[PDB]
Amino acid sequence: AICSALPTIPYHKLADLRYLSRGASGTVSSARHADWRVQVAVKHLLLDSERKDVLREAEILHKARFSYILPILGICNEPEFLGIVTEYMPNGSLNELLHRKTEYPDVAWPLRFRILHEIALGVNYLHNMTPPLLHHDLKTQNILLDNEFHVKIADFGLGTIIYMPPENYESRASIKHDIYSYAVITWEVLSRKQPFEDVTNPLQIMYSVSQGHRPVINEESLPYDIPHRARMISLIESGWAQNPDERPSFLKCLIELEPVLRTFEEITFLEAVIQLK
Amino acid sequence: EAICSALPTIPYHKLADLRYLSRGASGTVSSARHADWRVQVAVKHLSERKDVLREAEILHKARFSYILPILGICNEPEFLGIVTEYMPNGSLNELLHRKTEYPDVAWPLRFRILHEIALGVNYLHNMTPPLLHHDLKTQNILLDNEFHVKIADFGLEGGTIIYMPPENYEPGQKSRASIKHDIYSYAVITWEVLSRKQPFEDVTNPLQIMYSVSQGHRPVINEESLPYDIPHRARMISLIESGWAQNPDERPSFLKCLIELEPVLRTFEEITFLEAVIQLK
Ligand SMILES: CC(C)(C)S(=O)(=O)c1ccc2nccc(Nc3[nH]nc4ccc(F)cc34)c2c1
């Protein structure tokens, strides 16, 4: 019986508003809060219904507060400006980390596994809310990284189709969507390759997928020296199975990952991160 | 007008591996793991019922980057308790005073910690209505996996007196509403952080301390406790001295302290923070 209101932030309290990116849900800018003295992120798109969406997103971030979910700091709601304010993630997205190879030549295994564990922890948290909250748009672009490269998931429960399960083409009630996305992401994290790299059309991907084809698993995509290779391959293969019923819950997924994570000393995570600086 | 988040209720039986950590004024604290969420957690437990409920409500309302995150509440016939994220690195107190376990504590880490305590307390003060700590000490500044600060036990056997401003020695409606209590505590903490020494180490009589403190005395700001090599020494000593001023109206706000601290922090390269943590492992 304990409630908490989301702070309202006066637009005039946000200084140095610089453009970061624009996307389907709005434009994201970095700023600083004049009173709290911290860097923040601001998201802004006004139609009669376009308002109910921004407010629903903010309500979602506020209810889904957890260690691996992007923390919301407050709603900026005035007659002039309408925006969401959250912590600022200084390390970008998992997509950048995996694919900017000149900037990041080495991403050590312990850090890759910690990221995979945290993405699962975050999604598992969502699924355990009452009522259950489904992500449905999980991708490397919205898995964000904080100052120590810990995961904060964003843009859930509200572009690219490589993370979308086949049954989702021709559904909104499916609890086996997220795990599908997760299998692809896992493949992507362990290989640092773009899923279906030889495809010149999104439709060609969607076609292959509907026919049961998946990102390639072989020695070139996943070298034999990858720690716990066999176990990860099983997890990936069951996660993206054509038949949703054969896909594991996140509970099962976490239970499989726990013994893998225990094999890594806490200092190896710190060393992996400092290597990136 | 506003959007509302309900604090989750956590069944006690959902907590596995419950182990004892410590017994504090407000209750027993234990570590555990949540069976469904698969994360480690801390659990605080003991009609002295609406006291637990109030602490929970406060933690829930004061959610912020430098405040201990609450995950849910345990409210059952048998058991009452609060559940929060587990802090793997203890308290600031153990960091400063366990010199064997922690031979070095690099300046950049010390300054980030000071900067974070300030951001935390400042945030409380800026809520509406302003929320005041009044028992800020090194024992309840908690440290996360990468030594970032999370402040606990605000707005709520007796403890230490060294962080208490003289005027509060005999409490009333005047001092319980004082918006200059926390800054005094912060000043002492700032001194304790920069020196790794117990304030009033010489005096081993807590009551004697209270007299000395009432007379104007503060911890020893000499060369012996605060070496000349301390980064931005002059600027820090100035911050401390004005923070623990015998007169409440001569004490600065936290927003004021932050604005001075900002330039100091910018002088340390990011890499040094990570280097400080690896050295502590
Ligand atoms: C993604 C990128 C790395 C290309 S970015 O440079 O655009 C970037 C960087 C840093 C961020 N830090 C925090 C939050 C970001 N975005 C958001 N996703 N969902 C949001 C909902 C509300 C909100 F206020 C911000 C939201 C960030 C975006």
Ligand SMILES: CC(C)(C)S(=O)(=O)c1ccc2nccc(Nc3[nH]nc4ccc(F)cc34)c2c1
């Ligand atoms: C202090 C120590 C380092 C000697 S400890 O070993 O007791 C310790 C270790 C780790 C912790 N992690 C988190 C929170 C702790 N304590 C708490 N303060 N306020 C709380 C309110 C609710 C709650 F659930 C826990 C709370 C911790 C305490």
